[PDB]
Design a protein around this nucleic acid. Structure first.
Ligand SMILES: [Zn+2]
Lengths: 75, 104, 102, 159, 187
RNA sequence: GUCUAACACGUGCGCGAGUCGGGGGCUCGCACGAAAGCCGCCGUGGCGCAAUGAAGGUGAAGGCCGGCGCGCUCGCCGGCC
RNA sequence: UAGCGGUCCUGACGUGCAAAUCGGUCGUCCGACCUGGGUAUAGGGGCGAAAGACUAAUCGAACCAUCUAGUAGCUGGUUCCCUCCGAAGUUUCCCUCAGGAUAGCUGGCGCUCUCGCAGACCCGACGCACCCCCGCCACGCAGUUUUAUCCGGUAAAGCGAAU
RNA sequence: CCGGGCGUGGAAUGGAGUGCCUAGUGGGCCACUUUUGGUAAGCAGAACUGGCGCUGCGGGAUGAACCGAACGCCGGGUUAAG
RNA sequence: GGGGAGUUUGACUGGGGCGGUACACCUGUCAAACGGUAACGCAGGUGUCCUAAGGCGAGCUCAGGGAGGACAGAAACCUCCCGUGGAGCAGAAGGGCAAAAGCUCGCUUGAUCUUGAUUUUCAGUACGAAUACAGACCGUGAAAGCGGGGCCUCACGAUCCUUCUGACCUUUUGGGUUUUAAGCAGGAGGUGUCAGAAAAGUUACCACAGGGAUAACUGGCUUGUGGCGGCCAAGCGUUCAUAGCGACGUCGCUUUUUGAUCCUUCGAUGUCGGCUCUUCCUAUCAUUGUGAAGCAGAAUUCACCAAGCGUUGGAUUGUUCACCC
RNA sequence: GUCUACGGCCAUACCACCCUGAACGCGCCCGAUCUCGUCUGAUCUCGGAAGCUAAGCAGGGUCGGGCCUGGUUAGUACUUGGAUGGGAGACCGCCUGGGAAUACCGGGUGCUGUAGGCUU
């Protein structure tokens, strides 16, 4: 037969009844989609960071001593 | 459209670009049997019915032409298949047009 | 027609007025003050609705105002040329023509 | 009326404003974008490759990927009543910095300097942005005359 | 009439909730007094858990208990569980410690007493210490049950990683289309 | 208007790295019992503890460091976590 | 004329004498006539000087029983009290347009923290308590204005500015 | 990436975040304002917001929407539109 | 092989497979300076085309106008000057471009092979289309770089089955070999009802479920078309605008026409015309009382108060309507 | 003051015309064997350095056009929000806030980073 076409107005209150408004922010996030060359390289940095501890911490025990002394030695 | 008979491109089996010869594709017939055809026959068997639905309302007026590429390196037999956007006419390696001198 | 896709087609051609438009300006000799409005009041009976009639505060179809217009012409800032009068600023490069004869 | 079309109603949007139909001045190419400073998205027209969609013309959001010559951007797209934090790629000719954050950073620097100076002088000044308060009570000297008499203009007709 | 909206009037975090067998009900009738009249937030949380349903008090696996009680600074402290303790066969090292849980499985009880620790029922604990005094509190993992791999983004969306409901795992069940770009499209 | 049976899903109630008398079997004792109790059945077997492949199939952690193998990518005992 | 029929009164009765009769006036009345009994033809079948007529008050496919409560996106109805919360008639896809699926809107079950039984001491440019939060995140949010910095090209206006 | 020092920054409000299962609906209608088709229609079709739908009370005599206005059962006083 | 059988014979739709696709698409506008947005709203286009009309690199500038030059003329060809896109970019329109994205050459296949990410429509599913990177082989250019189709916005397609290419792949059932078959990947064969059924009529012999969500009547809203007036006054009325009329304009009324719409009934309001009977309205054909006139009388025309009382007999059609004695 | 190479803003920088010229600085200009390319050493390319600043170029002048920026246009046009405000309507007034653009009349006519000269 014949039907009557739509009408679209209450779907503005429908949302705001209790609709959220923010994307639920967070601190450091998922590196999905970064430039994969940078991804690989930064990963090598990370792997040799949590390796190279006789590199990292054995060349940062120095800075630990230095800051832990100077932050008082200003006095 | 139109395409020349010989063009260089990536020959996957080779591992590099090589020259290729192009032959436009045409369909086959039947392997000799194929369990699709085989069940379709045993389904047609017996009294009655057209089992699998024949197809009558046609609406497309040109088939997606396909170029078949053959390598040319000795003992690189490989042949690889490639597509081309639709067309209502096709030619191959024909007579090329020079411009700036066209007369009606 | 049967509303199954009704949409009209060109016919007649009208003009849209605005409150404060000027649908007719008659120019003549000042002696004809009571012929101007007398005649022009007839048009009030051909047009739809009500249209106030009015006597201009200007010399003619010029941009200008009451007859200090002609003083300005004497000053030569207004040049009588055609159905209207041509304005003249004091700009322009004729700073030798304005010398020779302004 | 119409539906899907990658650029609908962008006859005026992407239009290279009303005299600058020239080639791209190069500084927009030469600007340095980093990871995580607030760009904003205004589409050009001459670039022809990599435009943001017209839904993102004007929105502004963080930047998180940096390719050769096009950056990724995180912006908030409005959809039905949820709000999505969508990610896109944009050729760098359509983005530019946004002073919104930079002014905040400048006023951060002055706040911290003022805090340090309060450390030095012992006095606790008021830190930034108390909002605009109501007017104070001041004396208006009227030496010079008695005030002007102001009175309505009688009607006149200028058609 | 005010213009407040009412759909959040009543808090669903029920107050005296499901409490059906007399032993647990009596434990509640005991710790209710402590919760009222002792500032020990530890008793608040313990009582708030004595209401939960078993799907919200999963069983504290003894290997988890061991590797969460070994951590530094937590010597000679009673480790308290509101759920139950099921022994693990992933662990060979005889335990070392002292617990306090509702129900403890027979194997784990055998091995604890062999270890020379103790078992404490919540009455024993309360009379031992009217509040949290050197007591560590744990919980078995509560995102453990199976149905969580069913929940989430509905499978078939571009990057779900959820388990649909299919009645086997054979090759012919769901892996047909919408799974392999050789069959129409992939997730 | 799950009316009843069979699915399946989730919540909730009661018994744990297992769980389950499920079909059979045993006391003879048959009003009450067509129940109740018992078992190398203790479980063939279901469901679970292990995924993935179309299929042959493969199937869950490293770290310090002694040397010799150019510590050469690396390996073999090392002592240890 | 009996017999057989059944034209016109659009006559009568029309909860009737009758699930089709009556009164008059009507065609035929030795031929293709009217009629009793016997016998045959059976349902997609017979039989029809053919109107889809007749086949037991039923025929453009009879009656009975079973499959069988066939089936329906379609109308009808869908039985005690109070208390609490409370919409949709819009998106997309559909042999889709009186229908579903999906989103949205809805209720219920709960959870993770806030920590206002906040003593017998002792502060925040972080809120609450204020003895003070060892035990304490004032963290977070907004259908709102404010201060900044951005985006558009409608209203208005223009042609001695292009079309 | 590891270590160190400095605390929270504009007004007004207020507890937030998070999961599972899920009935009804997918014939709307009207009004201030904007707007297309028509000569216009209690006509057809759109945007915002609010209502009627799902809702009673005072007032417009009478009424789906207009104006005021939001309901447990009552006593006293006071108003809105009128 | 309609003798006999089973079954189908789209949707949208100002009531109805009549017309037309608003059924997939893309541009401009409506569209109200986020940006979404409706009607069988308006102006339009597509189911293609291109070995270059792709990719680079170099070199030139187009439209038209002005002055000159033998045939040569309004227009061939040559030269100078002006030359802000007025031209060309395959096609609709919009955007974009001037040592280019146009014009001419030169070289070439990046129109290739391979994972993932994102945009576009939305459930933020796919197909289509596009964005930006990464790994290979390349192209051009000195080189920097640019290129993975067309300067951007359209130009195309699921399960099943068939067909072709791919690795010295897996399986082919107790084992081995070989044919063949099934596998795994990528393309193609197509579903224009364009998320993708395989399909002709007629029912005036019709049937059942429903619908006033939807027509044919009256009833309502509207009054374009139909009818009745009013205003303005160039003229006709020999003379004279208004005795009587009235063009070019314009404002209303009435619902005695015909439309437009779907609100009320589809588990029913009996729907043409005629016959008989009552009553009502007035914008009056006749009559009572009046003004006016191009009114001498006689007739007749305009207007006022006014529905108390009249408004016929017949031929022809069913006639309403008409026509004639 | 000023020029040279690369530029950023891309008209306060453009266009027209006249005047002025603090090196060989750019450039005009003289040739074509080498390199190169054209029908033409006009262009491109190469090799030069006799004269020239006539031109470009720079600076200046213009009751110049243009352009940028101010006024007047105007609290007008316009609009968020309100009413049991007027009007038969078409439209309009008011309360509350925001607030433009022509015509017309002023002013201005490149600034500047970098590396490198000269004071003709
Ligand atoms: Zn090859």
């Amino acid at each position: 037969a014949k039907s009557k076409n739509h009408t679209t107005h209450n779907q503005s209150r429908k949302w705001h009844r209790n609709g959220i408004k923010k994307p639920r922010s967070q601190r450091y996030e998922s590196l999905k989609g970064v430039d994969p060359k940078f991804l690989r390289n930064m990963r090598f940095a990370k792997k040799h960071n949590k390796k190279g501890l006789k590199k990292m911490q054995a060349n940062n025990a120095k800075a630990m001593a230095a800051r832990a002394e100077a932050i008082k030695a200003l006095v | 459209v139109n395409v020349p008979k010989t063009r260089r491109t990536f020959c996957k089996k080779c591992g590099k670009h090589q020259p290729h010869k192009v032959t436009q594709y045409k369909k086959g017939k039947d392997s000799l049997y194929a369990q699709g055809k085989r069940r379709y026959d045993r389904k047609q068997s017996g009294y009655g019915g057209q089992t699998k639905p024949i197809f009558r309302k046609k609406a497309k007026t040109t088939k997606k032409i396909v170029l078949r590429l053959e390598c040319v390196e000795p003992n690189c037999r490989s042949k690889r298949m490639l597509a081309i956007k639709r067309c209502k006419h096709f030619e191959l390696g024909g007579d090329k047009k020079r411009k700036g001198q066209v007369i009606q | 027609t049967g509303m199954r896709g009704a949409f009209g087609k060109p016919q007649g051609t009208v003009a849209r007025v605005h409150i404060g438009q000027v649908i007719m300006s008659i120019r003549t000799k000042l002696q004809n003050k009571e012929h101007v409005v007398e005649a022009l009041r007839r048009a009030k009976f051909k047009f739809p609705g009500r249209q106030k009639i009015h006597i201009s505060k200007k010399w003619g179809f010029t941009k200008f105002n009451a007859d200090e217009f002609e003083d300005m012409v004497a000053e030569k800032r207004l040049i009588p040329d055609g159905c209207g009068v041509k304005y003249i600023p004091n700009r322009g490069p004729l700073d030798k023509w304005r010398a020779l004869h302004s | 009326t119409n539906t899907k079309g990658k650029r609908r109603g962008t006859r005026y949007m992407f239009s290279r404003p009303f005299r600058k139909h020239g080639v791209v001045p190069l500084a927009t190419y030469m600007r340095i974008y980093k990871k995580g400073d607030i760009v904003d998205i205004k589409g050009m027209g001459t670039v022809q490759k990599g435009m943001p969609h017209k839904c993102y013309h004007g929105k502004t959001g963080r930047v998180y990927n940096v390719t050769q010559h096009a950056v990724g951007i995180v912006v908030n797209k409005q959809v039905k009543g949820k709000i999505l934090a969508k990610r896109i790629n944009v050729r760098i000719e359509h983005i530019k910095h946004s002073k919104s954050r930079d002014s905040f950073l400048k006023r951060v620097k002055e706040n911290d300097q003022k805090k340090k100076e309060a450390k030095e002088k012992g006095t606790w000044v008021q830190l930034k942005r108390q909002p605009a308060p109501p007017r104070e009570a001041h004396f208006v000297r009227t030496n010079g005359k008695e005030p002007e008499l102001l009175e309505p203009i009688p009607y006149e007709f200028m058609a | 009439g005010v213009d407040i909206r009412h759909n959040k009037d009543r808090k669903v975090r029920r107050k005296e909730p499901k409490s059906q067998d007399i032993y647990l009900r009596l434990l509640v009738k005991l710790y209710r007094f402590l919760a009222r009249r002792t500032n020990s937030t530890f008793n608040q949380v313990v009582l708030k858990r004595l209401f939960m349903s078993r799907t919200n008090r999963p069983p504290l696996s003894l290997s988890r208990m061991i590797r969460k009680m070994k951590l530094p600074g937590r010597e000679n402290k009673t480790a308290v569980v509101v759920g139950t303790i099921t022994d693990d066969v992933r662990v060979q090292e005889v335990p070392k410690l002292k617990v306090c849980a509702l129900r403890v499985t027979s194997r784990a009880r055998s091995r604890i007493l062999r270890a020379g620790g103790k078992i404490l029922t919540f009455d024993q604990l309360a009379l031992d210490s009217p509040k949290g005094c050197g007591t560590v509190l744990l919980s078995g993992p509560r995102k453990g049950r199976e149905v969580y791999r069913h929940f989430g983004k509905a499978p078939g969306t571009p990057h779900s990683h959820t388990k649909p409901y299919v009645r086997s795992k054979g090759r012919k069940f769901e892996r047909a289309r919408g799974r392999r770009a050789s069959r129409g499209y992939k997730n």
